[PDB]
């Protein structure tokens, strides 16, 4: 079901996925950090504004990420 379709090192992306009562809530924040060592998360405070609310109603216990390769 393709129900929802939307078209809108130097970059850190933070997301929170939260599945409550059949609602998938995605909070997001993008920040342009400059850090020499990417071995650790940077020290600081970033507030995550809410982005996406989906009434999918599915049951989730596992997840995986997608990569772009050539």
């Amino acid at each position: 079901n393709c129900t929802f379709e939307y078209v809108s090192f130097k970059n850190l992306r933070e997301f929170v996925f939260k599945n409550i009562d059949g609602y998938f809530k995605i909070y997001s924040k993008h920040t342009p950090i400059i850090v020499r060592e990417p071995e650790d998360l940077p020290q600081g405070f970033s507030a995550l504004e809410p982005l996406v609310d989906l009434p999918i109603g599915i049951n989730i216990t596992r997840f995986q990420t997608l990569l772009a390769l050539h």
């Binding site: 009562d21 059949g22 609602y23 009434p55 109603g57 599915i58 049951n59």
Partner: protein
Amino acid sequence: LYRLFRKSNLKPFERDISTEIYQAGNKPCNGVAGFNCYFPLRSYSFRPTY
């Protein structure tokens, strides 16, 4: 078609569209329909004379 058997009760505002055979008995069905392996979806056959 109405569901009659489930492993557990659903969470609110959730759906389960899988039509797999439930293990009604302790014997494993393993994809075989039979006794103690009842199909979950059963219709009611609605008639105006009921």
